Symmetry: D2
Subunit: 258 residues, 4 copies
Amino acid sequence: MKYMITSKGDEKSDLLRLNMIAGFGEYDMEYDDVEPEIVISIGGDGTFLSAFHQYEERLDEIAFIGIHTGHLGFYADWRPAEADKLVKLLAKGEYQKVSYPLLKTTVKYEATYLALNESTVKSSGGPFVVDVVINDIHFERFRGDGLCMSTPSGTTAYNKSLGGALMHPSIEAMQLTEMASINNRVYRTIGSPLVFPKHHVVSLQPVNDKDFQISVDHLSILHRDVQEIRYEVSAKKIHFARFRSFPFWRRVHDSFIE
Amino acid sequence: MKYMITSKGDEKSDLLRLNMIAGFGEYDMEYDDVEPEIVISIGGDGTFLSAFHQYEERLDEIAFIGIHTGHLGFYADWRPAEADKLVKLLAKGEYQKVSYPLLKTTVKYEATYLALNESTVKSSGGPFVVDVVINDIHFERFRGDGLCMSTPSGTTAYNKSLGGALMHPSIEAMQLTEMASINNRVYRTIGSPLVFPKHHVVSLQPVNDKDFQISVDHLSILHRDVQEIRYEVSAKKIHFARFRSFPFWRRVHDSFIE
Amino acid sequence: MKYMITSKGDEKSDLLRLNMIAGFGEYDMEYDDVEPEIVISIGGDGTFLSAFHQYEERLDEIAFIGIHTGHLGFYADWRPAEADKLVKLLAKGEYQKVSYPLLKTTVKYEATYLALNESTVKSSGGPFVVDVVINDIHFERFRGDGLCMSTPSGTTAYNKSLGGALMHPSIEAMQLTEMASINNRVYRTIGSPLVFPKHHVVSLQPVNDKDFQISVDHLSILHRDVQEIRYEVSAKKIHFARFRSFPFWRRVHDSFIE
Amino acid sequence: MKYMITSKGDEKSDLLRLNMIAGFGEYDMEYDDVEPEIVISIGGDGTFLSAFHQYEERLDEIAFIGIHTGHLGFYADWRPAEADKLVKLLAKGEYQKVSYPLLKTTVKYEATYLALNESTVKSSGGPFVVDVVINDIHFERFRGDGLCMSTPSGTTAYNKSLGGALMHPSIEAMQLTEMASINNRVYRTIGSPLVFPKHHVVSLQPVNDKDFQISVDHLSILHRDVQEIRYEVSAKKIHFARFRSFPFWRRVHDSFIE
Ligand SMILES: Nc1ncnc2c1ncn2[C@@H]1O[C@H](COP(=O)(O)OP(=O)(O)OC[C@H]2O[C@@H](n3cnc4c(N)ncnc43)[C@H](OP(=O)(O)O)[C@@H]2O)[C@@H](O)[C@H]1O
Ligand SMILES: Nc1ncnc2c1ncn2[C@@H]1O[C@H](COP(=O)(O)OP(=O)(O)OC[C@H]2O[C@@H](n3cnc4c(N)ncnc43)[C@H](OP(=O)(O)O)[C@@H]2O)[C@@H](O)[C@H]1O
Ligand SMILES: Nc1ncnc2c1ncn2[C@@H]1O[C@H](COP(=O)(O)OP(=O)(O)OC[C@H]2O[C@@H](n3cnc4c(N)ncnc43)[C@H](OP(=O)(O)O)[C@@H]2O)[C@@H](O)[C@H]1O
Ligand SMILES: Nc1ncnc2c1ncn2[C@@H]1O[C@H](COP(=O)(O)OP(=O)(O)OC[C@H]2O[C@@H](n3cnc4c(N)ncnc43)[C@H](OP(=O)(O)O)[C@@H]2O)[C@@H](O)[C@H]1O
């Protein structure tokens, strides 16, 4: 089966990658980083996010696996000492596939992006003001530092820091949180995070300034002459290769509690 | 078609009820408060909640409708001046049905309850400490004032006041928020709200004291010698009779923004 | 010098107390629990709080010291292994005095209380609604679970759990936090915590129900037929005996960070 | 008495300024924008902030007054219809002076600034990580979007949006709030806002990147090769000219409640 391996690029990670490739050399298994079916990321969640965006045009044909060389990750959930056990189990399709929802962002002047964690919007100068339209209905005028739209698996990331809820990734949804909203007798936002199902469209529209810094996972690009930013749960999903039970809520406990 | 009407019990509401009954007297329509198919609540969301619990044994055979005699409600979403237009449209099944998820609570010493808004748990004295187990996995030890588990439509209620997200009620889920958790170098909770899908079981277990004040919507009962409190998305749903489009997010805007 | 010693009442604490008394038997030092000048508390912050209220009529004539037999305390800030070094240093007034502000609560039907941590107010049934008057000016109508008024040293306690700021205890102030306020288009509270200087009077007045559960540190009493609850920074202070530098912010770091 | 008048620069404000100057032409009163003793700002709080920074080298010799041509301000607290009554009362020192605390920021590579609202710190790229040192003691390592240090009168501004407490400006203090901190099992911040008295020094030190975007009220400057950012309550104060009672908490109510 075709496979490739990305590495964080420090010694630990590069050496681990070379050993797994040697381990794969003993099986009906070929290294192909153009059309892989398995993509292994070694490092952290940032390495994993890059792996994802490296191959976002072939999401339906790939199963992703992560190894965390440092502390435990949400995406990278094998340890390095289990690398040889992983090579073996992958050798004979010894695994089921789990799919997580993704977020589609569309920027109109159309540019389109997929996010596995989130996409955010901030001003370029400059005060940030946007009208927030849900399924064509004007919901609120937001004045503040910015807004964040998170996938379910992204809810443990930036979303969490903004006061958002943690959502189980089997729920096909997206979640909008505020960054430092101005609320006074005249200016009013909802305050609360908002959780949208598939097929709901959240559209952001400028009020005066039309330049925004827009982020999609790690990527951050200043966009000029924007007319609309549109968010929706993507039709596409990320597929993970799973060899044992490691439940989301256990992943959350391990990362945040002890 | 069989129908009944509950009233807040002030003059406005009682008089409105008598007029709708007179209006229904002109159609193939009989008043039955033992086996209604339509249940009309006149007053506020508290009146509507009572209507719901009055007939919780026949949820699958009833369509609920609410009229708000005061300010706009989340459940009661006709105005009184539209009462006559409502009587007419109800006369000939001129309507589609919308269903909202509900919350099952089980108290073991089994007593079982349905909630349309939420169920909460607090101590009776007395410091509140509980172990929180998700799908048999020990997730956290909670020390604080209490916990709240909200349905999607309940997310605009007590959940909102506790920092929770607002969830679209087409999402079959429940949401757990904290009330004043103690967090220090030794005591640790997740902090964030948590959103669970159907079939996930959140169980609360005592640590020392086993007496808790437990609430289910308006009802609040001191329970003694508790071994477990179990939360899950119910298999049962509340059905609403709908005569026009009034989207959830518009309902939220109207109630919280302007 | 006259002194007494309170104990948590477990073996560790009782034995430690007996040894310090034996150690004090070797100096110009007599045990008097009616008119002490030094009050030593052995246990936790709860033991220390009790020590304080045991002698609240002689606050101006007492220096308090705490020993924490378990984890580190905010009030109890010697370890047990340093008990003998403490007995020695106390023997010859080898110490400076530090004073912390306190909170005066007045309940009118007058009953008056001092708090070292905080005083809170909740309803007895029953929905909680109160008008909040600051220096005779009507500030807001609060609807929610309750309110908490914290001293500076109390800001690390319940205040912290409610979202309040941590205040350095050299600031003569009190801080009011909300518990789960209802905020909708009709009902409005400030949301933010509020920090008042000496001589500001915060008065809470009932709207309909006049029975409230009122707490002052550990004490919690249901009060009936209340007309007013009045908060102000007390004219009286708690005095601590200090033998070495242990800064507040270091105390906060040690307890909350690592 | 020497005086000058700044204007927002729209027609309402410019015309109001010309009329007050004409009104002042009838008294022992001369217009001097180099060495004024009275500085009148017409517009909003942004206009007032600019007035302040325009004359920050002569704070001890100036009394500031604000007129709000739009909605009510925290600094600008006369209405335009009362402009003629204001000209008259100013004519014969018919007024007492009120002083508010200010914030000193020092940036070391020394550049120094005064803030009436706040100073904030964010990264230039780029992840923001800083060590936070209080009175030479290492308190925490902050990872997140940034930090905000607010004066008492600034607590109704950006501080409020970040979850901070509102402080009465007679309290000589500063208040530090977090912007979106990362908190997981490894990374730890205090979370809570922190309120410091005069003479406490909060120092921020870089960990890796040494370029930061630093804001002081409206001014925002990218600073390069920073070694330290130091915050403390300034020795200097802003003086307001006061003609009638308009208490802070009433100002807060009027702006945030109704
Ligand atoms: N202010 C703030 N607070 C919290 N999170 C932020 C903030 N700013 C950015 N981020 C997050 O950082 C990532 C950028 O990715 P990256 O390239 O790694 O850059 P970074 O700035 O390095 O990411 C920040 C941290 O977030 C961790 N991370 C990434 N994804 C998750 C999920 N899904 N749950 C929990 N923790 C996660 C990541 O783990 P890792 O250490 O890589 O194993 C880092 O520890 C972005 O998608 C945001 O979600
Ligand atoms: N501290 C606090 N904060 C917020 N909400 C609380 C709090 N304590 C209780 N409650 C809520 O109050 C209800 C009890 O119902 P009730 O008999 O009406 O008693 P109440 O104490 O009267 O209810 C409190 C308010 O909550 C409103 N309410 C009820 N349901 C909702 C939903 N789904 N969204 C938004 N607002 C709602 C209700 O509307 P209404 O005025 O009836 O049209 C009241 O204005 C309970 O289910 C909780 O969700
Ligand atoms: N829901 C909730 N959250 C946070 N704190 C609460 C809550 N409910 C009550 N409390 C606090 O608990 C105390 C009651 O005192 P007690 O008799 O000990 O009862 P408890 O319920 O045991 O107190 C709760 C905890 O608060 C600790 N505590 C007490 N004072 C402080 C200060 N000043 N800073 C930090 N931590 C503190 C105390 O330390 P300790 O363990 O005694 O050394 C306990 O760990 C009360 O004054 C409140 O401030
Ligand atoms: N994200 C976010 N949330 C809240 N406040 C922010 C935010 N970003 C910047 N700001 C504040 O905006 C100011 C910048 O001043 P400005 O030139 O006016 O620019 P702006 O971006 O226009 O200021 C934002 C708003 O803050 C108001 N403001 C200014 N000072 C105060 C105080 N002390 N209390 C309450 N409200 C206040 C001001 O009133 P005004 O309308 O001028 O009468 C504006 O309505 C800065 O000092 C921050 O405190």
